[PDB]
Symmetry: D2
Subunit: 356 residues, 4 copies
């Protein structure tokens, strides 16, 4: 509250410049910020032991790919550890990435915490000392952050305490990052677990984005210097009905265009477990849906950009190339999807049609 | 909650089609819904008695204008009296408007009500009976409604209680229109009274808007089936900073693109006191503002479409012609401005250059 | 707003007096404000034609009772019509009651209205013109008002929209009434329909009270000048478990002590549906419940104070005495219950 | 959810019992949870070097006072370092207190954070990982917590954002304490800084509290196992109008009874800034105030119980008895004031 402006014109100019730079010409985001535990889950699928070193090795293969990768990839979100890791010749990754023209980002949330008196719902931690962490990250070469909330549809979820309380941690999160020069990505993911259908997700997704944006305003957040990583709108995991990229597209741009201000510059979708192929086909329909779409509609993918590469790697140095090839192909595909230019092409083996 | 949808797909299709038809090709709205008191203030300016007959005569001139007016005017908001008045031959005004291909709206709000413990802030009455009233008006040829809220800037204004309550009332109101096939026009006006500058206005307006839409969302309103009639972002009346349309537009378009969703099909500005030429220069500047503009940006003009015609009328039937040319001239200019093409020469036309219409 | 006080010290004094006057000493509230249709449902039970004369005749009997009765009833809520009716002699009922020592109140809401996009939830209508209406009633010798909201437990009810919207209308009405000297009686009723149990209603009643209060607070309503008429914590109508007055008391005072500020002078249960005997025992248990109870706990009953009286009247003049007797009886039981005396042991 | 209870009845039962036992018979709380910096200020006053030794030493005099202080003091708020500090004989202070029948509490908040876009307003940090800390503290002898939010009166403060956000932080914290068997003392202080008068402070005190309690209600906090530590209502510090204890009381009780729920078992007024005597007089009055008072009304004082003792100590070990005397004296005065039985003489 009121008068007493959160930011200078200059601060805004910087954050709006970073933000627009990452989704600039069909480019997207590679989401490599899996934590120790989450990355172990990934490495498990290819039966690779979750070691720091293995983690360092897979990331180094992805980050050392030809600078051309700049033409699909606008930023890369890193987990803390990886932010401080290095190459073979300790070139820190973060500098391998900045030098190729890629903007570096950082996971700033520190996970869930249960919210008592609720059907298993949570909020997210990490606001304590966030300012000071953001400043050091700004110093170490980071220009955007990521904060993920997780909301479920189930008996009595997403509760109100749940949507408002996760919308306000997001809003504090967003507020602090801006005071430090980082563009905040607000991730209010609504989890595809369960058997609801398309309309149900569409509705919850609309009620969750309306909360976020009003919280977001109550806390004086600067929409122009922010990015949204929403869930696309689909039926749940256990839904038996079958849907089309085009139906996911309508439901998804419908929901957004009723709740996401045109000032937000770019909307980069989470892929969450869709196969790589669907991730791409869906984003591509999203860019051709015949509705008002005032922002860039792009990707911030984690699994949809790294499954087939993980699989080609299998933890063997010897696979460097195949690993590289995979990620590059997914990366290009999502760039065309980002421009509504993708045509069923791209990666084809079971891992692209995988499901995650 | 949820899975209790408020509208069917076919009700949505109808409100969306209505709502877009009104702002379709640079068109705008003529806001002729001044109540008796308000209208009295207007006619007082031209020293004409505020008679139900004087009122019916000045509106007869305006609506009997050449057909071509439907190139500029996509809809016309009427005050209850007027919705039931007649031409000089017993032909109903609402039927004349409707045959010339112009959508008819009706003022649904019923004035303010003081908010106790507030520094002179109000809310707006009109929801009791609202449904039974829209139903009937729909039957009577009406396809859209208008509800005006009034917020001001001042010591302890606009408060949370006032913003909150006026958004909710707006909320109920838009809900109810939608259930009866009327497209709600939502007008949370921020008045220009006072000396704040543009930056302050812009901030209150972003504040007001964000509450409005979250509220409409709580109430399940169908945005696609709505129109928004807000104030342009300007300095207060008594502020002394002088600004440029272009400054006006940057503030306006900035605020609106951070709170009004892209699903709203059009936003028709009230002109609230701005000279006829200024309401034209501004709207025009808003259409060329280099920011995202997902929605039509047009006019819904009370005074700014009528100053000149009133003055020409003088309350004399022999002035019919002049009266109609004034009206038509501002209706066309406005529609060009709604398309970012009004390259007025600064207007000459005192009528058009002066403050406006027992305003304050 | 922020300074800009709602009311003066004197308005306050006035309203605070009204408020405490009506629940002053064990007494309670006769809710005779049934509406035309509602009142006819009551007449239908005893097979009497809903007619304005039938209605004026019934109340006439209830209001002509032995003065006394200002030692149990401290206020009587009337439906508009009844406010301007007479007795079999032009005496205006509103004068008969004043002169008996009883505060007369008016129903100010105007029934429900559907909230689109809800599972059949409603709001209430009535604020348009309320202010004007309030001024005249105050001038016609009404000192307090009543507005009922209805909330229900059901698939996705009560919704947050429902609760929020109902609490705000209630806050508008309550602010409005003070501005014209009535003390507003805030009635957010959680209907018993359905099969939920006690603890489900407790939870839903404690959430609805938190809402209303919060709103009253936003609307700068003067609580010390108010009165509440909440439902009692009970299992739903279709619940098959069975419970004890004392179990309804604990459920009820628990909820109320967690949400209704000690500044509200009195909370006056509605009974809607409970037999005459139960509304007296539960109120009674309510007053014996061992929690902290900063406010008077009492009744503001409609059926529970009249059902037997109607039965006795039968719409027959001849039945007058029987009729008053009954009403006079239930009114003492509940005064005594209001004091936690009512040694109970079943009455009529 | 809704339904899906936050606590079992057992859990309630314990939090309830702990909550009441602290305010049990006119008893109150010694707040010795000043941080290293704050304590520094207080020692600055008697001219003693802010030293963990000094700190440690000064508290050791207050906690070794005769057991009879448990007639007046129901619990003590410690700051982290101190929760693990020992006497001159290696006996941990918390055990010394626990053995004289005093319940021990831990500061949980972690200070302030700037709320951009506000006129100097803040929120409070400390929720990250708070649960695992709660549990740890529970295992180290702790039974209740403490979280201080600060609001002030000034140009555009306290704002909606400040209000709502501190309320939400308070709610969360309260909730997480309950989940781990501590009783959360909610502390929404309205700072006295500034020129405002009585009625103003009372108006903000009422808005802050209605916000505090609805948010605890959104967050399923169980009030019967909570305590509230609010400011009393008084004019601001630079306000020239003089007022009587009776005036402070009517304004404090008026506010409190309009917003704080009768379930809350006890309300323990911070005194911030009040002289020891004024803190006793005003609490006393508060207890005679002729309005409904469903809750004990006591103290949770820091300066008000230690000023005279600190001056007597003078950082001189030889002043051990004077030092304890003073402290003991205010603790009894406040205990009487918590029973509206204090009189000067």
């Amino acid at each position: 509250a009121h008068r007493f402006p959160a930011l200078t014109q200059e601060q805004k100019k910087e954050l709006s410049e970073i933000a627009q730079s990452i989704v600039a010409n069909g480019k997207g985001i590679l989401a490599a910020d899996e934590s120790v535990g989450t990355m172990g889950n990934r490495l498990q699928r290819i039966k690779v032991e979750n070691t720091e070193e293995n983690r360092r090795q897979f990331r180094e293969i992805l980050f050392s790919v030809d600078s051309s990768i700049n033409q699909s990839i606008g930023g890369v979100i890193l987990f803390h550890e990886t932010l401080y890791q290095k190459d073979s010749q300790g070139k820190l990754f973060r500098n391998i990435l900045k030098e190729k023209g890629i903007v570096v980002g950082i996971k700033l949330d520190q996970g869930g915490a249960p919210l008592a008196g609720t059907n298993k719902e949570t909020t997210i931690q990490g606001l304590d000392g966030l300012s000071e962490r953001c400043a050091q990250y700004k110093k170490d070469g980071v220009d955007f952050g990521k904060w993920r909330a997780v909301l479920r549809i189930a008996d009595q979820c997403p509760s109100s305490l749940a949507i408002q309380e996760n919308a306000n941690a997001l809003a504090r999160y967003a507020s602090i990052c801006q005071q430090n020069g980082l563009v905040p990505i607000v991730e209010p993911e609504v989890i595809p677990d369960g058997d609801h259908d398309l309309e149900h997700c569409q509705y919850v997704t609309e009620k969750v984005l309306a909360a976020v944006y009003k919280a977001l305003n109550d806390h004086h957040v600067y929409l122009e210097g922010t990015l949204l990583k929403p869930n696309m709108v689909t039926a749940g995991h256990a839904c038996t009905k079958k849907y089309t990229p085009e139906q996911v597209a309508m439901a998804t741009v419908t929901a957004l265009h009723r709740t996401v201000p045109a000032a937000v510059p770019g909307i980069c979708f989470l892929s969450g477990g869709m196969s790589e192929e669907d991730a791409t086909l869906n984003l591509n329909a999203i860019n051709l849906c015949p509705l008002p779409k005032p922002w860039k509609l792009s990707f911030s993918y984690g699994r949809a950009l790294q499954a087939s590469a993980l699989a080609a790697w299998g933890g063997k140095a010897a696979n460097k190339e195949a690993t590289q090839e995979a990620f590059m192909k997914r990366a290009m595909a999502n760039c065309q999807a980002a421009k509504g230019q993708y045509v069923h092409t791209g990666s084809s083996g079971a891992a692209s049609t995988q499901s995650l």
